[PDB]
Amino acid sequence: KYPITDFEKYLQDITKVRGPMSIDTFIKEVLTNPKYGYYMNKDVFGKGGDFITAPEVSQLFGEMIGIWCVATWEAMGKPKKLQIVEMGPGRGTLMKDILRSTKVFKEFYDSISVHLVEASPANKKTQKQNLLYFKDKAINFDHKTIGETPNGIKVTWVGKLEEVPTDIPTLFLAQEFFDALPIHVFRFSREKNDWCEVLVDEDITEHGEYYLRFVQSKGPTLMTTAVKHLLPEFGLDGYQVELGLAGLAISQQIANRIDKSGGAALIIDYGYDKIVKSSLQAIRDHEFVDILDKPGTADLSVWVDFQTIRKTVKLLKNKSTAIGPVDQGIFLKEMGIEHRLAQIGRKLDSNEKFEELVMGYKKLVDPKEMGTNYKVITICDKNITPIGFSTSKTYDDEDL
Numbered sequence: 001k002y003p004i005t006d007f008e009k010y011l012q013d014i015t016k017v018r019g020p021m022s023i024d025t026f027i028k029e030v031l032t033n034p035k036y037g038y039y040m041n042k043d044v045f046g047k048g049g050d051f052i053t054a055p056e057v058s059q060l061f062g063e064m065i066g067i068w069c070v071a072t073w074e075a076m077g078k079p080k081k082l083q084i085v086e087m088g089p090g091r092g093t094l095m096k097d098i099l100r101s102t103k104v105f106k107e108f109y110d111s112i113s114v115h116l117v118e119a120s121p122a123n124k125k126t127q128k129q130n131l132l133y134f135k136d137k138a139i140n141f142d143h144k145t146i147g148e149t150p151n152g153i154k155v156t157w158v159g160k161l162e163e164v165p166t167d168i169p170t171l172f173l174a175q176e177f178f179d180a181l182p183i184h185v186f187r188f189s190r191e192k193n194d195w196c197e198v199l200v201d202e203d204i205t206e207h208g209e210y211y212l213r214f215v216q217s218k219g220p221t222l223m224t225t226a227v228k229h230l231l232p233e234f235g236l237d238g239y240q241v242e243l244g245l246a247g248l249a250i251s252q253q254i255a256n257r258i259d260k261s262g263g264a265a266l267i268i269d270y271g272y273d274k275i276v277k278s279s280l281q282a283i284r285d286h287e288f289v290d291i292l293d294k295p296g297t298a299d300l301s302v303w304v305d306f307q308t309i310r311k312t313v314k315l316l317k318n319k320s321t322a323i324g325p326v327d328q329g330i331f332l333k334e335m336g337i338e339h340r341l342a343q344i345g346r347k348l349d350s351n352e353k354f355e356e357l358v359m360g361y362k363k364l365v366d367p368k369e370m371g372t373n374y375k376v377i378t379i380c381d382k383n384i385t386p387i388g389f390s391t392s393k394t395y396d397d398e399d400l
């Protein structure tokens, strides 16, 4: 035990009036609740911005994504206006590396504007500070939703993808974004020959462990019935799956935007080319903890189901398709990262700086590091061949 937090008391109250809550609802509350959220007001973590992401590991990573943006823009017929959208830019490191490294491509750089989709006002402020040129001392970061980069590239912040202008060809970047979206969890009961949903209820049992607990819905919930067509047909008892419905909805918005106005999305994340049975994890001060251990104090994440993203896009039966996933290591090698590593290394004379650069390269591409756990998938037009996906597989059962 420990004594009951105010956020736990509040979540218990929801279960008393509304019944046990879906894991989707729980993840939204735990992250984004105004008063007790993790993503909204955590404050003062260990080290400087929480965790090791790929942009912060190497400039190599952002330069390669930059090359992908330019090559894809070329493959689209070099449109005079191109939007670049990023989902959850973090501190803005990725965007900064892209905008730095793609300045040399004059024709490309003259066509771009940037749109960052960001819900957190804290991250918004950090991104603005990281990306913008400022002419005034007093900056209120909330009335500043449009800005200019020091190279004069326009950057606009919006809360949701829906708010991004339509009818312009668009690149979409989602880097470690889908792993932080809510999921639902379902499990099959042979005792009721059907799927149940896994819910979070209050835990007042005589020797429970925490103040919340996982329960199985009595029958199928309305969500179970609504998504039955996405679940396995194989009813094995206790078989459990995670479904990233929030992410599937975003995948459809991107696919449909691309069908209408052209474009391409690059989704990079840790995950699998199959249904993910169990992956929801809670990390607090760099230690794995239980999900229901003081909720709101720990960062929740999931491993991404790339397969269901792919099938969902394909099921739209429009001009869009999804190709991949391919491993991050293979993707980046195919983009020319080894050549760039050597070029950057030759300009450096330090050896200490070169050793650091090579380790960052190894962290990105080695199979024991991020090389295989991290994967890349593209949502794009059927008729424009994607860049960096030559090793993508063919999925016969899903192409008629």
Ligand SMILES: Nc1ncnc2c1ncn2[C@@H]1O[C@H](CSCC[C@H](N)C(=O)O)[C@@H](O)[C@H]1O
Pocket (backbone or CB within 6 Å): 039, 053, 054, 055, 056, 087, 088, 089, 090, 091, 093, 117, 118, 119, 120, 123, 159, 160, 174, 175, 176, 177, 180, 181
């Ligand atoms: N529903 C939502 N709308 C907008 N942004 C979201 C979101 N859910 C999560 N995010 C954002 O996604 C980011 C996850 S952290 C990843 C940061 C960055 N891409 C990097 O790898 O360095 C956070 O900045 C968070 O604010």
